[PDB]
């Protein structure tokens, strides 16, 4: 059973533990946001805005720093900074949850504002570190370990996304179960301890996987941040894969979510918790099946053809969504159609995203991958920021139809731009 010691499985374990810690972290942040502060749209809105803006402005420099330094060093640097930030913030959660009642009651004033600024800043640092580590490990290490065998690379990406989805659906359940059985303070203590132990394990694990893959080793004073930012963006514009990334960034502006807890608008309206649980489970299962579908389609049709098929599937499913919303309380039929539509739009979106990830990992000169992926994430979060602004501009329940129409339109635009890329790079169907 040498598969247990092969760098493949070791890397899957590393990504799995990192994602598990991150998902516990995000669920705990949401529990803080809701238990202390009421279900207020603007708190979550400003949280998302701060995170998205910081990653937007820092993606190019993060990618440049990833590319310039050694893969090993940047890998554990990002890992350690992420884990220390999450541990410190888990300690802060311990203190605040142990002070929930009297913070709400005895001493009003700026204490809530101070704790919320601290939570958002440390969460933003943690998410920046998560973006850095995701870029470096996924892109560079996956492409190098997979080598020139592109089927193995596709399997790598697909199984990574499956692990991501299974974590996203299980970790919130585990954190909720333990927190209910104990107390929020116990939940936060457990999360902090688990992040610590996972930090140690993943440090050792990255050291191990580095050994087994020798190919990784071969590889105003603020003027230089702007020069690097401009150089990275212009390099990304010249990259022939620009259209696919642009369309993916468009696809990340959809309002039909049910993806995670930090990003959601059904809860913004106020839907019941059981329905959200069922929708999240269906979305996770459908995303896993979508990864399977992308694996199956890449072998039969071309990679660009696979992306195009995913695009048509996703677009037609959102056509089903817009038919559902356009139909004349509300009948159960319309809501059921909208729910099935978002669930199958999920499979379309994930097949498309795996395809675009494959293109990005494939068509880079390998001297520039970090910067290209960093600006890719910056664009993704830029259109996520516009998504957040659009949500902010329409709190009213009597705007959901317009919001859905806008999201479908932007999805269509993204797939049209990917279609332009397909025409450019094939000229054959």
């Amino acid at each position, epitope marked *: 059973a040498d598969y247990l010691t092969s760098a493949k499985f070791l890397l899957y374990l590393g990504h799995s533990l990192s994602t598990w810690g991150d998902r516990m972290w995000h669920f705990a942040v949401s529990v803080f946001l809701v238990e202390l502060y*009421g279900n207020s749209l603007l708190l979550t809105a400003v949280y998302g805005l701060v995170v998205a803006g910081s990653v937007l402005v820092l993606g190019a420099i993060i990618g440049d720093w990833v590319d310039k330094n050694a893969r090993l060093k940047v890998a554990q640097t990002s890992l350690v900074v992420q884990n220390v930030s999450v541990i410190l913030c888990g300690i802060i959660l311990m203190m605040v949850f142990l002070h929930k009642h009297e913070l709400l009651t005895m001493y009003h004033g700026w204490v809530l504002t101070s704790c919320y600024i601290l939570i958002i800043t440390i969460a933003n640092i943690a998410n920046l570190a998560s973006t850095a580590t995701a870029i470096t490990i996924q892109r560079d290490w996956i492409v190098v370990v997979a080598g020139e065998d592109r089927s193995k690379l596709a399997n790598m990406n697909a199984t990574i996304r499956r692990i991501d989805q299974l974590t996203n659906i299980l970790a919130p359940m585990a954190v909720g179960q333990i927190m209910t059985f104990g107390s929020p303070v116990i939940g936060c203590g457990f999360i902090s301890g688990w992040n610590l132990v996972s930090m140690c394990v993943e440090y050792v694990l990255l050291w191990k996987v580095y050994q087994k893959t020798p190919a990784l080793a071969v590889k105003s004073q603020m003027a230089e941040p702007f020069r690097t930012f401009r150089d990275g963006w212009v390099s990304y514009y010249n990259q022939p894969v620009f259209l696919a990334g642009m369309g993916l960034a468009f696809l990340y502006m959809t309002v039909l979510g049910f993806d995670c807890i930090t990003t959601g608008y059904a809860y913004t309206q106020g839907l019941s918790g059981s329905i*959200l649980s069922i929708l999240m489970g269906a979305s996770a299962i459908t995303g896993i099946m979508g990864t399977v579908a992308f694996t199956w389609l890449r072998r039969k049709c071309g990679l660009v053809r696979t992306g195009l098929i995913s695009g048509l599937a996703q677009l037609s499913c959102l056509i089903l969504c817009v038919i559902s919303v356009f139909m004349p*309380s509300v009948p159960i039929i319309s809501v059921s159609l909208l729910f099935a539509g978002v669930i199958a739009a999920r499979i379309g979106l994930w097949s498309f995203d795996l395809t675009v990830t494959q293109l990005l990992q494939e068509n880079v000169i390998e001297s520039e991958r970090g910067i290209i992926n960093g600006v890719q994430n910056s664009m993704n979060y830029l259109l996520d920021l516009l998504h957040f602004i659009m949500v902010i501009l329409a709190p009213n329940p009597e705007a959901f139809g317009l919001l859905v129409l806008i999201s479908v339109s932007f999805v269509a635009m993204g797939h049209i731009m990917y279609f332009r890329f397909a025409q450019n790079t094939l000229g054959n169907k």
Partner: nanobody, 120 residues
């Protein structure tokens, strides 16, 4: 997200009466609302149920038919119309919400309670 209900009191047996639950922080069309009875000397019992998504009711077996429940999204409230009130109906009514919260973090929220008594 505190909720308040009013309209309790005393009516002759076999009469009719109407409790009105007014809710503020949460929708009363996207969350399962139910009613419970708190009779003296015994623990609480289930009255009726409105589903979260559809307008379908799940009245209790013992009191089925003779109770009616209806939600109103415009006024942001839910109603119970009572008919043919019997002496065993004397109890304290609790307006509640089940399964409100996160995708995987949700609770049950309760009202202050109103006294409804039946005399013969």
């Amino acid at each position: 997200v505190q909720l308040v209900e009013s309209g309790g009191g005393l009516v002759q047996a076999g009469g009719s009466l109407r409790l009105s639950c007014a809710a503020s922080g949460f929708p009363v069309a996207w969350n399962e609302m139910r009613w419970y009875r708190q009779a003296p000397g015994k623990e609480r019992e289930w009255v009726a149920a409105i589903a979260s998504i559809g307008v379908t009711t799940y009245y209790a077996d013992s009191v089925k038919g003779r109770f009616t429940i209806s939600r109103d999204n415009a006024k942001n409230t839910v109603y119970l119309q009572m008919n043919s009130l019997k002496p065993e109906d004397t109890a304290v009514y609790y307006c509640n919400v089940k399964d409100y919260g996160m995708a995987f973090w949700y609770y049950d929220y309760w009202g202050q309670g109103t006294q409804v008594t039946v005399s013969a």
